[PDB]
Design an enzyme around this catalytic site. Sequence first.
Site, PDB file in Angstrom:
ATOM      1  N   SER A  61       1.221   7.756   4.488  1.00  0.00           N
ATOM      2  CA  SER A  61       0.985   8.035   4.791  1.00  0.00           C
ATOM      3  C   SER A  61       2.251   8.090   5.942  1.00  0.00           C
ATOM      4  O   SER A  61       3.006   8.857   7.095  1.00  0.00           O
ATOM      5  CB  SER A  61       0.953   6.511   6.027  1.00  0.00           C
ATOM      6  OG  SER A  61      -0.730   5.865   6.304  1.00  0.00           O
ATOM      7  N   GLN A 117      -9.486   4.293   8.983  1.00  0.00           N
ATOM      8  CA  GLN A 117     -10.002   5.061   8.188  1.00  0.00           C
ATOM      9  C   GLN A 117     -11.215   5.843   8.778  1.00  0.00           C
ATOM     10  O   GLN A 117     -11.908   5.297   8.716  1.00  0.00           O
ATOM     11  CB  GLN A 117     -10.424   4.179   6.482  1.00  0.00           C
ATOM     12  CG  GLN A 117      -9.699   3.281   6.443  1.00  0.00           C
ATOM     13  CD  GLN A 117      -9.556   1.842   6.136  1.00  0.00           C
ATOM     14  OE1 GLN A 117     -10.183   1.268   7.248  1.00  0.00           O
ATOM     15  NE2 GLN A 117      -9.040   1.269   5.108  1.00  0.00           N
ATOM     16  N   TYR A 147      -3.154   2.183  15.094  1.00  0.00           N
ATOM     17  CA  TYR A 147      -2.854   3.042  14.128  1.00  0.00           C
ATOM     18  C   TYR A 147      -4.331   3.297  13.334  1.00  0.00           C
ATOM     19  O   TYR A 147      -4.736   2.580  12.722  1.00  0.00           O
ATOM     20  CB  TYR A 147      -1.607   2.226  12.681  1.00  0.00           C
ATOM     21  CG  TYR A 147      -1.221   3.330  11.898  1.00  0.00           C
ATOM     22  CD1 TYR A 147      -1.525   2.943  10.631  1.00  0.00           C
ATOM     23  CD2 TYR A 147      -0.434   4.264  11.809  1.00  0.00           C
ATOM     24  CE1 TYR A 147      -1.200   3.655   9.495  1.00  0.00           C
ATOM     25  CE2 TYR A 147       0.417   4.867  11.162  1.00  0.00           C
ATOM     26  CZ  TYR A 147      -0.484   4.198   9.730  1.00  0.00           C
ATOM     27  OH  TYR A 147       0.632   5.122   9.056  1.00  0.00           O
ATOM     28  N   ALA A 315       1.882   4.423   2.937  1.00  0.00           N
ATOM     29  CA  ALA A 315       0.878   3.777   0.534  1.00  0.00           C
ATOM     30  C   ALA A 315      -0.176   4.971   0.447  1.00  0.00           C
ATOM     31  O   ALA A 315      -0.960   5.177   2.006  1.00  0.00           O
ATOM     32  CB  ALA A 315       0.869   2.618   0.883  1.00  0.00           C
ATOM     33  N   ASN A 340       2.441  -0.127  -4.811  1.00  0.00           N
ATOM     34  CA  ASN A 340       1.768  -0.108  -3.531  1.00  0.00           C
ATOM     35  C   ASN A 340       2.750  -1.633  -3.116  1.00  0.00           C
ATOM     36  O   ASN A 340       1.541  -2.804  -3.716  1.00  0.00           O
ATOM     37  CB  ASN A 340       0.746   0.058  -2.492  1.00  0.00           C
ATOM     38  CG  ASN A 340       0.717  -0.218  -1.204  1.00  0.00           C
ATOM     39  OD1 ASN A 340       1.388  -0.379  -0.875  1.00  0.00           O
ATOM     40  ND2 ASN A 340      -0.340   0.016  -0.733  1.00  0.00           N
TER      41      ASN A 340
HETATM   42  C1  GF4 Z   1      -4.493   5.838   4.306  1.00  0.00           C
HETATM   43  C2  GF4 Z   1      -5.531   4.449   3.189  1.00  0.00           C
HETATM   44  C3  GF4 Z   1      -5.374   5.405   1.994  1.00  0.00           C
HETATM   45  C4  GF4 Z   1      -4.819   4.107   1.262  1.00  0.00           C
HETATM   46  C5  GF4 Z   1      -3.462   2.882   2.180  1.00  0.00           C
HETATM   47  N1  GF4 Z   1      -5.020   4.256   0.222  1.00  0.00           N
HETATM   48  N2  GF4 Z   1      -5.613   5.218   0.028  1.00  0.00           N
HETATM   49  C6  GF4 Z   1      -6.248   5.603  -1.086  1.00  0.00           C
HETATM   50  N3  GF4 Z   1      -5.522   5.453  -2.648  1.00  0.00           N
HETATM   51  N4  GF4 Z   1      -6.427   6.249  -3.229  1.00  0.00           N
HETATM   52  N5  GF4 Z   1      -6.940   7.068  -2.968  1.00  0.00           N
HETATM   53  N6  GF4 Z   1      -7.177   6.478  -1.524  1.00  0.00           N
HETATM   54  C7  GF4 Z   1      -6.370   5.345   0.849  1.00  0.00           C
HETATM   55  O1  GF4 Z   1      -7.044   6.684   1.296  1.00  0.00           O
END
Ligand code: GF4
Length: 358
Positions: A61, A117, A147, A315, A340
Amino acid sequence: APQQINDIVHRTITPLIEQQKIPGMAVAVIYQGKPYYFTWGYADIAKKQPVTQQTLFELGSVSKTFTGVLGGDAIARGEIKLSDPTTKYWPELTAKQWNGITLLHLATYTAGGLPLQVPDEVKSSSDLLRFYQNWQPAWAPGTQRLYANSSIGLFGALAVKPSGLSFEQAMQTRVFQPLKLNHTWINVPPAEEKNYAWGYREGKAVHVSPGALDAEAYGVKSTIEDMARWVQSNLKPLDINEKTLQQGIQLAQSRYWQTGDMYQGLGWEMLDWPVNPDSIINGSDNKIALAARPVKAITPPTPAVRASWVHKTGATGGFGSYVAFIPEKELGIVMLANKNYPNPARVDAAWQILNALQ
Ligand SMILES: CCc1c(C)[nH]n(-c2nnn[nH]2)c1=O
């Protein structure tokens, strides 16, 4: 490095790496404008590749700061206005709920509860239109902040429409290239694959998966050196020679909304310095919950405040990043890790370091 910087960084980061079981970490401190770099551990455990100043990390992000600045640049170019209705750039968005939802709302998570999402089920661009057409807001525009990747993700995609460039081409040409961020990528090129760290989740090696509006919301990968340069650029936008980009950076740090002690910019989030460490780490702004928060409009937006703690957490499944800076002090930090780990730990370490050096 000056011994004070060396000591504060190592004494803060070493226990952090231990406590959090972080496989690899790169840190940059910007102090009086100059960058100082620190690396620990492994980019790839299996292949015993160390983290270096050239290692690429998934920003997650923190990418939103690039999207915010690219959007600001487009404003400065006169290509878009934040007061524009969303439908001006996507007129196929005919569903009524979109009346009164502006590019500002999209950029600042204030559209009325767009989800965190985009569903993984959304694979095509007709899937994406359906998604936004069918979305029902919980709240009127400009009343609550939630958010959301689906919010700023859409802003990023629409912000580049008038240019006729893809989001990636626009970012490359208008942000990365002028700032000499030559090892910052939306898509990691084959040439750079040797430098791409693996993320680690439950002990596995992972990379971010493709998803709708990923580039715009969470898709950037970068080195500690480029990220230091990114902080420098945001600390002192007046040094930037490209007019619209200088102005775009300034617009990204404007204060559009207030929730508690936090101010929402474009990508960047801000608090008045001196900052009480508790707020960002513990109270309401620590990011362990998903929180709907009423916002107060700042009418008109306050231009970039020098005495601010300007920051963004980031993250992916396998990476944890954090960037913070204080413009008035010419002071900043970037922390990039291939695990993370909890946000409060990031903020604590960053405060501990910057407070000692300010
Ligand atoms: C921003 C939402 C998201 C996170 C926190 N991890 N992630 C992700 N990790 N690997 N593929 N997608 C995502 O798509």
